[PDB]
């Protein structure tokens, strides 16, 4: 199962970040509408979220679910986090290879202020 | 001569015979021999009792043995000093607690059943009593 | 598809005795001559 | 041909639930991981559990496998 394999892949990282006790930037990727979220160390609340599923961010990019979409979401999370106040975060692959859209989102985020 | 096959260990501790019997009810036949006393039965005693009943019933009915030795017992050779390791295994015994059902039987009249069990109990070292299958 | 590890998969036209001709990509080589095919056979 | 034995390794729980410990103190000595490290608890190379911070030690059961965890709260 794709989901079961993915959860098994990301379990070690999630546990490592959980015991470390640090805010983590978690990204969920699908064939469309790449998501992104910021989670408190306790893991119970979401500091801020962004994605291409809402019209506020989906009204510019031609198509959601590409490199451009990842950069927009990656950038979008940036100023939101900077405005909120949190600066340092830990990136979570969530079992997605850090190659394409995931890398583009992270690259946009780190260059936008969320260094990690 | 009941005996296990390829037991895990050749020797085992003496242990104790405290407690109370578990198989206290007739489960296969209609009549059974219940153990009143406490002790151990060797393989030879079980065989002797079994032969006594089979002859008594004249190979009529069914016989169930509800006890297995599964416990080796050692014995030092004559003119041997204490120590120098555990003794060699000689015979196998089954620990019996009060209420244990030794033998079960079915397919014969109650009258013939009583004498058959009485003959067997005469060749056992523990007080025994005759019981009948209960309804629930 | 890995490179320079697979045999050449060029197209080649093959025809049999009963007049049926078809194009197939394989490793047969330069030319091929057949006598029977899926049809025109006592299957 | 018997008569051989090994010196006892004095394993077991050294600090029990609800008693304060200092950082670096050994909590449990074990061969495997009968208890898993929780919060402010580190695991040694020999699966020894030691306190990474000062506080009260507590035991709990967590996870889908109901495996036992040892944590420390700064109290």
């Amino acid at each position: 199962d794709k989901k079961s394999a993915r959860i098994r892949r990301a379990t070690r990282a999630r546990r490592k970040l959980q015991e470390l006790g640090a805010t983590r930037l978690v990204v969920h990727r699908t064939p469309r509408h790449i998501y992104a979220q910021v989670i408190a160390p306790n893991g119970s609340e979401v500091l801020v979220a962004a994605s291409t599923v809402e019209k506020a961010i989906a009204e510019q990019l031609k198509y959601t679910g590409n490199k451009d979409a990842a950069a927009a979401v990656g950038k979008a999370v940036a100023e939101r986090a900077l405005e909120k106040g949190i600066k340092d975060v830990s990136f979570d692959r969530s079992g997605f290879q850090y190659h394409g859209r995931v890398q583009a989102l992270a690259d946009a985020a780190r260059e936008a202020g969320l260094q990690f | 001569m009941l005996q296990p096959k390829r037991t895990k260990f050749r020797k085992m501790h003496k242990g104790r015979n405290r407690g109370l019997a578990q198989g206290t009810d007739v489960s296969f036949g209609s009549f059974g021999l219940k153990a009143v006393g406490r002790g151990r039965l060797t393989a030879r005693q079980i065989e002797a009792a079994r032969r006594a009943m089979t002859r008594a019933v004249k190979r009529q009915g069914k016989i169930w043995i509800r006890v297995f030795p599964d416990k080796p017992i050692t014995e030092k050779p004559l003119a041997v000093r204490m120590g120098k390791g555990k003794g060699n295994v000689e015979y196998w015994v089954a620990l019996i607690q009060p209420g244990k059902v030794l033998y079960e039987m079915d397919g014969v009249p109650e009258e013939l059943a009583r004498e058959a069990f009485k003959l067997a109990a005469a060749k056992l070292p523990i007080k025994t009593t005759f019981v009948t299958k209960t309804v629930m | 598809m890995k490179k320079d590890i697979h045999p050449k998969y060029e197209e080649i036209t093959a025809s049999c005795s009963c007049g049926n001709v078809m194009k197939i990509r394989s490793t047969v080589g330069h030319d091929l001559n057949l006598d029977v095919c899926s049809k025109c056979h006592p299957f | 041909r018997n008569g051989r034995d090994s010196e006892a390794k004095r394993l077991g729980v050294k600090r029990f639930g609800g008693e304060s410990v200092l950082a670096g103190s050994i909590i449990v000595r074990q061969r495997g991981t009968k208890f898993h490290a929780g919060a402010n608890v580190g695991c040694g190379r020999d699966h020894t559990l030691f306190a990474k911070a000062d506080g009260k030690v507590k035991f709990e059961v967590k996870g889908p496998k109901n495996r036992k965890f040892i944590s420390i709260e700064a109290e």
Partner: protein
């Protein structure tokens, strides 16, 4: 690829009408094919493995991989991790052209032909079979090879049972004697 269009043209409709499914994807469809060659005699002469792999590359469109023993068994004098066979799995587009070569040029060229078997089903919808000799495929010239070893074929589909798998294969004009 030509039969893939043929499959997409009316075979899907033929499957649709006969089973009158609710949807279109319910119809069984092939997803991959697998070629096996359990040579077994690697111990006697491991050098022949390379050429045994080579011919499979002749029939197939890609390089085979050599499989290793799952475990060591004393009855066969094989140790764990020792190559004792090769296999090939082909899917996507390349499977279709190979399926053509099997169904058009290979089956007719069977020595002492009697008819393709119809009981060779695993019980779930997957078909398997074997061949005596390599010359059935055109890629053997009878002079560059001197071995009698055969190979095994196996086509797997999304069928939930044998009845639709057999029906789907029948749509591909299989002999089934």
């Amino acid at each position: 690829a030509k039969l893939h269009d043929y499959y997409k043209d009316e075979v899907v409709k033929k499957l649709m009408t006969e089973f009158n499914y609710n949807s279109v994807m319910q119809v069984p469809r092939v997803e991959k094919i697998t070629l096996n060659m359990g040579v077994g005699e690697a111990i006697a002469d491991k050098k022949l493995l390379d050429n045994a792999a080579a011919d499979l590359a002749a029939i197939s469109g890609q390089k085979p991989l050599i499989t290793k023993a799952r475990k060591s068994v004393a009855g066969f004098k094989i140790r764990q991790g020792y190559p004792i066979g090769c296999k090939v799995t082909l899917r996507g587009e390349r499977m279709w052209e190979f399926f053509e070569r099997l169904i058009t040029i290979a089956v007719p060229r069977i020595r002492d032909f009697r008819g393709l078997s119809a009981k060779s089903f695993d019980g779930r919808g997957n078909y398997s079979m074997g061949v005596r000799e390599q010359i059935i495929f055109p890629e053997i010239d009878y002079d560059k090879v001197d071995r009698v070893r055969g190979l095994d074929i196996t086509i797997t589909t999304t069928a939930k049972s044998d009845e639709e798998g057999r029906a789907l294969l029948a749509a591909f004009d299989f002999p089934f004697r």
